[PDB]
Structure formats: C-alpha cells, structure tokens
Write a protein that binds this ligand. Structure first.
Ligand code: NAG
Lengths: 445, 99, 50
C-alpha cells in the first residue's frame, strides 16, 4: 500500500526539512509507505499559499503537512474547513474551534501566567512581537485587571534593520526612568538574540534584574553571555534531554552527514523540528490504525479544480480526521493526546532557571496539577538558630499575661529580652529563647 | 471566488468592503495582478499599493482629545474587528506620556 | 570586564600606554564607566593628517 500526502515548507526551513526526512526512514514500515510531494513557498503571501493548496488538491492527497503565519492562517482554515481536507501543523495554535486542523504545538498562556504568581510580581514590563498573534498579550492584559497588576506593553517588532541600535537603546532608557526591573520577552529565537546583545552593551545584565523568555525553546538560543553576569533568567522547555527516548535520538542526530542532512551535526534540536519529527509518527500511526479496522479510503474519482461551484465535500475525509484525532503515541515532546477540536491535551512543560553552572530544572506544569515543584534542593542548614539560655527573674525575664496564646519568643518580656533583641541586631543572628531547666544560676558540686 | 470571476470579466477597478479576515487576501491579489481597489473600510496598517482608502485615520484625533481633557487614568474597551492598531497606538503613547 | 559586568557606572579605568585609541574602544563606550588615557599622536595636526 502507498499513501500519498502533501508538504508545504517555507523558504529556509533547513533543519525542519532534515528532521522530516529522518522521521520518514525510522518510522517506515514494510506494510505501507508515505509519498511526500514537497513544495516550497513564501508563507506570508496569501496568493502563493492559494496556488499551493489548489495544486495539491488537483493531484489528490489524503492529508497535508505545512506551516502557516498570521498573514495566512485564515486562508488555511477556510479552505480546509470547506473542502474537508485535514491539515497537521507545528505552528501557533489558532483562536477558536476550527475543524480539520491539527495543532502539534502545546499552548503556553496557562504556563506563563502561573509562573508570574510564583515569583509574586505586581509591576513589570512586557515586550512583544506581532508575528504569532496577540493572544498572549490579550491574556496578560485581561488577567491584570482581576489580579491587580501593572503591565507596560511595548511593541518591538516593527523596528527597521538599519536603525536597530538607536531604537533599542532609546527603549531601555525609557524603561529605566520608570525603574522597571522585571522584563518579559515574547519573541522568536532570532529576535531574542538581538535584544540580549543590546542588553549587555548598555550594561543591563547585572544583579538586580530578572528576565523571562516566553517561548518553548529556552536553550536553543545563545545563553553563555548572560550566564556569568548576575541577572536571573527563567524559561520553558518541552524537550527533555535526560529522557532515554530523546537521548537515543540525539545520538543518531549528531552522527548524521552535513552534506546530505544540513543542520544535523549538532548537540541540540529546536522545538519546531522536534514537532516535525513527531508529526510523521502521528500520520503513520493513523493510516496503520485505519487499515487495521478495514476502512477503505480509495478515491478513483477525479477531484477537479478547487474552485468548484458549488463546492462539494468527499465523505472519506470525515473518516480521516477522526482517525488522526484518535492517535496516542510517545514522542520527543511527550505524550501526544488530542481533544475534539484538535489541540494537545495531557502535556507537561518544564520550568527552568539559568545558573552559573548552566540551565537547571525546578518543576513542571500540567493542566490538572497546576504547578508542581521538584524537591531537589536542601537549604536552610547554613543559617544557625543560636540557643539563648536564661532564668526567670523579675524584671529581667517575665512571662506575659497571654502566654498561652503566644508561642516562642513572643511569650516572654523583660529587661534581658530587650537586651537580647539589641545584641542580635548588632551581631546579625537569629535566636530562640530557652529557660534553664534546673532553675539555678550556676555552681560546682 | 468573487475576485477571480470579475477578473475573468475584464473589469477596470473593483469597489468593495473587507474585514480583518480578508484584508490579507485583497491586498495580496491586487498587488500582484495590478488592479485598483477602492474601499470605504478601515485603512490598512503599513503601505500597500493599488488600494485606495476612503476612510480617514483616527489615531491622531484620539491622542489630541485625551490630552485636551488632561486624563491620566482611564479604561479602554475595544472590539477586535478593525484590527488592534488603535490599541497599539494608545499603549505606546501611554508609556511615553505616563498614563 | 564586560562579561562579568564591570563596566557599569561607578568604576574608573586608566590605560597606561602611549596608544589609547589603537585598541578597541566601542564596547566600553556606551557602558557607563569612565576611561582615561594618553596619546602622543595628534590627528588634528596638519602634518599628521597629511
Ligand atoms: C496522559 O494519559 C496517559 C493515559 O492515556 C497516562 O499514562 C499519562 O500518565 C498521562 N499524562 C500525565 C502527565 O499524567
């Protein structure tokens, strides 16, 4: 059996194209195969996407894999919803309930909000880019009203290439006048690397500053330069290199050839290319399951042109989208389980922090168990509680009248109690008052 | 569909309305196929050739009237249908002028 | 100095050689720390500028 699908790739998607071919070879089975039929296009142009869709509809495809942008998300979901052709994508999740579209990227807005109440911020800044939609900005602005925040939102995306350095430096000086110590960065990997370089040059990576990089790829960008500075950096990642299934893949990924597979000989993989590798597994698992329940999707009749008046559906496409949503496998991202609409549910996002040793892990995020810390830290033994012994004699140490209600140091009062408070302030320690058990000042038998 | 059917008819210019969902379809087709489009809808953010906007802008008029009434704290209620370009103007001006 | 964050305001540096502008100087320029130095070659002079 040979199942024929379609592919839509942007210009310059070199690492995602390589991980697509690697997923073809490993997830190949002797029972059936997949035919790619790969095309290349400009993703921002709605004219080029329209020609690419109606071309592959004429040849006749069972499913289409591709990327989209904000400028062409409406062209995809309208064609796929009308002409009943399924669409699997690693791009940003759409807003609403669009049929026939499978989102392979997990949502981020719930994880980003929960991290902010953990650090307990009341006032911060938010730098955004308009490329992935404004769904993350609308989430934090609506949530700021009910939970009493003060958010400064600045658009950084439309900066021209020739005048970058004047505009970024004028931006942080305006933040300096407001004394904004807390910055959230919502940008792609290339735009974050440009902002981080402008942070260091004007001297904004010193102790006292905090940064949150709001994307699924934390360690994909350059991170060594802000590491030794002194400012805390937090972030998110969905790919766990400590997992055995991922670590087995990285060993095969590093040993590949550069001249055949460009971008292969590295130690890391992007989160975009990881979801491209997982999507080949989901498509293969569906047609393997579809043949197993003996469902025929053969279409001997010609499709015709896409611009058909009236537009007619084909009822085998309803069967295919139900098969794609009923796929549960294990991948690089983790457990892949879908709801009715096609958005990923039952997933985990790893909250990370930057240290001088390197990036670490401090917990995870799930939609059932909101934020769970990982108890790998033992601290507090460095601080000492000094044991202060005393005797009960008036007016030196006396018991207060409500000693039953109070506990510990609050129970006692007197001259020596005030003296103990003064010495601990000048010396710099903490104490716990204990009455001597014998009740005597001191002698030697 | 309606753009290409009239393009087969051989029309000189096209008069129509667009929404936020179909703003990207119109400006891309008319830019490539070099046909003029005259519209009373909201102006596009940025510059696009072969599109004639009949509606004037409003972002300068709001920032004058707010400054004239001398406001420092207010609430902004918006609908998403004409884009978010008006909200981006009053958020960038708020940081500069302490609102 | 820059990587560990020691070019901020409050610091001063004197580079004790006859060539001050021969080295790279743009990176500590916008930081905030004062830098002093020495030079014997005057580019404003007409004999040097020729
Ligand atoms: C997701 O569901 C599967 C069973 O369908 C379960 O084994 C797994 O533990 C779930 N994920 C999490 C994070 O609990």
């Amino acid at each position: 059996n040979s199942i024929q699908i379609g592919g839509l790739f942007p210009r310059g998607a070199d690492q995602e194209y390589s991980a697509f071919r690697v997923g073809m070879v490993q997830f190949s089975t002797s029972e059936f195969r997949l035919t790619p039929h790969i095309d290349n296009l400009e993703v921002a142009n709605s004219f080029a996407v329209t020609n690419a869709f109606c071309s592959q509809f004429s040849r006749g495809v069972y499913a289409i894999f591709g990327f989209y942008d904000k400028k062409s998300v409406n062209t995809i979901t309208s064609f796929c919803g009308t002409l009943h052709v399924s669409f699997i994508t690693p791009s940003f999740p759409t807003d609403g309930t669009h049929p026939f579209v499978i989102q392979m990227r997990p949502d981020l807005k719930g994880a980003l909000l929960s991290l902010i109440e953990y650090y307990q911020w009341d006032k911060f800044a938010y730098l955004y880019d308009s490329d992935r939609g404004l769904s993350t900005l609308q989430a934090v602005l609506d949530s700021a009203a009910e939970k009493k925040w003060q958010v400064t939102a600045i658009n950084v995306g439309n900066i021209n290439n020739d005048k970058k350095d004047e505009t970024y430096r004028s931006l942080f000086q305006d933040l300096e006048l407001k004394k904004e110590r807390r910055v959230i960065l919502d940008c792609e990997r290339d735009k974050v690397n440009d902002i981080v370089d402008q942070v260091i040059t004007i001297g904004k990576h010193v102790k006292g500053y905090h940064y949150i990089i709001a994307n699924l790829g934390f360690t994909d960008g350059d991170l060594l330069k802000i590491q030794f500075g002194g400012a805390e950096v937090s972030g998110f990642q969905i790919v766990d290199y400590d997992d055995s299934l991922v670590s087995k893949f990285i060993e095969r990924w590093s040993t590949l050839e550069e001249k055949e597979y460009p971008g292969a000989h590295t130690a890391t993989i992007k989160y975009t290319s990881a979801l491209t590798y997982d999507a080949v597994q989901v498509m293969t698992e569906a047609f393997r399951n579809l043949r197993k329940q003996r469902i025929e999707i053969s279409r001997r009749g010609n499709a015709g042109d896409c611009l058909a008046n009236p537009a007619v559906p084909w009822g085998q496409g309803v069967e295919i989208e139900r098969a794609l949503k009923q796929v549960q496998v294990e991948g690089l991202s983790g457990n892949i389980k879908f709801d009715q609409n096609g958005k990923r549910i039952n997933y985990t996002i790893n909250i990370m922090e930057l240290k001088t040793n390197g990036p670490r892990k401090i917990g995870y995020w799930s939609e059932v168990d909101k934020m769970v810390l990982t108890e790998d830290d033992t601290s507090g033994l460095e601080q000492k509680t000094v044991v202060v012994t005393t005797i009960l004699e008036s007016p030196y140490v006396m018991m207060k009248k409500n000693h039953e209600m109070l506990e510990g140091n609050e129970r006692y009062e007197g001259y020596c109690v005030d003296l103990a408070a003064e010495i601990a302030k000048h010396c710099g320690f903490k104490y716990k008052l204990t009455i001597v058990g014998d009740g005597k000042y001191g002698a030697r038998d």
